[PDB]
Design an enzyme around this catalytic site. Sequence first.
Site, PDB file in Angstrom:
ATOM      1  CB  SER A   1      -0.677  10.077  13.456  1.00 26.18           C
ATOM      2  OG  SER A   1      -0.977   8.794  13.909  1.00 26.18           O
TER       3      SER A   1
ATOM      4  CG  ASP B   1       6.077  14.796  -4.454  1.00 29.37           C
ATOM      5  OD1 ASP B   1       5.588  14.386  -3.394  1.00 29.37           O
ATOM      6  OD2 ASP B   1       7.192  15.362  -4.579  1.00 29.37           O
TER       7      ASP B   1
HETATM    8  N1  LIG Z   1       8.401  14.362  -2.155  1.00 29.18           N
HETATM    9  C1  LIG Z   1       9.510  14.245  -2.913  1.00 29.18           C
HETATM   10  N2  LIG Z   1       9.421  14.624  -4.208  1.00 29.18           N
HETATM   11  C2  LIG Z   1      10.533  14.635  -4.955  1.00 29.18           C
HETATM   12  C3  LIG Z   1      11.769  14.255  -4.486  1.00 29.18           C
HETATM   13  C4  LIG Z   1      11.878  13.831  -3.174  1.00 29.18           C
HETATM   14  C5  LIG Z   1      10.749  13.811  -2.362  1.00 29.18           C
HETATM   15  C6  LIG Z   1      10.832  13.385  -0.919  1.00 29.18           C
HETATM   16  O1  LIG Z   1      12.182  13.397  -0.456  1.00 29.18           O
END
Ligand SMILES: Nc1ncccc1CO
Length: 330
Positions: A199, A35
């Site tokens: 962007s 993430d």
């Molecule tokens: N980037 C993320 N990682 C974990 C939970 C939610 C998100 C995005 O709303």
Amino acid sequence: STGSATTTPIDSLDDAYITPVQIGTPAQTLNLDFDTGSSDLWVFSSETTASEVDGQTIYTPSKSTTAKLLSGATWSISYGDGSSSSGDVYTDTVSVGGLTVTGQAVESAKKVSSSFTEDSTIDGLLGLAFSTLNTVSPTQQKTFFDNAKASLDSPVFTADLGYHAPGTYNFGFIDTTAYTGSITYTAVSTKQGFWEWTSTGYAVGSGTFKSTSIDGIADTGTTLLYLPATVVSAYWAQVSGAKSSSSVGGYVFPCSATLPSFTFGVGSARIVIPGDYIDFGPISTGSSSCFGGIQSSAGIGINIFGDVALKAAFVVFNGATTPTLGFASK
Ligand SMILES: Nc1ncccc1CO
């Protein structure tokens, strides 16, 4: 050093991607959601409230000869979508794709929100945003990338997400076979702890490109593309029968429609998101209303270049002293 790991969509809609990660000695392999919008590496564990575990693989630090409690350290996180988790902290050896970090902070969940419990395929998160967002207290911890950086051949990782197919996360090198043409690099602001970039504009389908600055973040853990309401309305106006539904929570469109592509600018370069990438299928099983992959960011407070966008590109997260993002077509 380098590492290379395959990332696999958790379902037929590419809602998220999981990447196997080895933790501890002997290795415990957990499938984590990488993430780039957050900075905690947290796992379902032997400490997770039993009622909050439903099929996940758990990390058991007592079975790892290299695990050590990070005494006194706690963590708690809340995400853009209302989900959360919290717990305590171990240090252990963590390997991704052959690349090993010793002494990595592994945040062990005691509590997770319902959306995590319900995702049996995701055993935790590996955060790849800047370590300034890490939630460990009282001693903030480093991300896996920040801990690996000095050992890497080049201080970079790349995201190559697939459309309805596996892809790759690489650490420490740029696979020149994985993309077409050249990589266009663009400036990053780290002021909010994110991979925040600007962007240079957009086009809808075969339409003319609109030159306009759109600040946003490159977020591998966010499924959809969130953009200003003006841009989003301009896209959905090209799809007969599309509308914003307050009841569903965004733009929906008839599942008989053929969607136009969406182009976004990276400097003078252009990344084209095919229309099929924007179809997130029926809003409920058997419905003829489909959920759109491009949604408004109004209320969220930031534009998000989520997976709908990044999966259209080969993306370079350059963690040099002055960070930059790179985009190539593929
Ligand atoms: N980037 C993320 N990682 C974990 C939970 C939610 C998100 C995005 O709303």
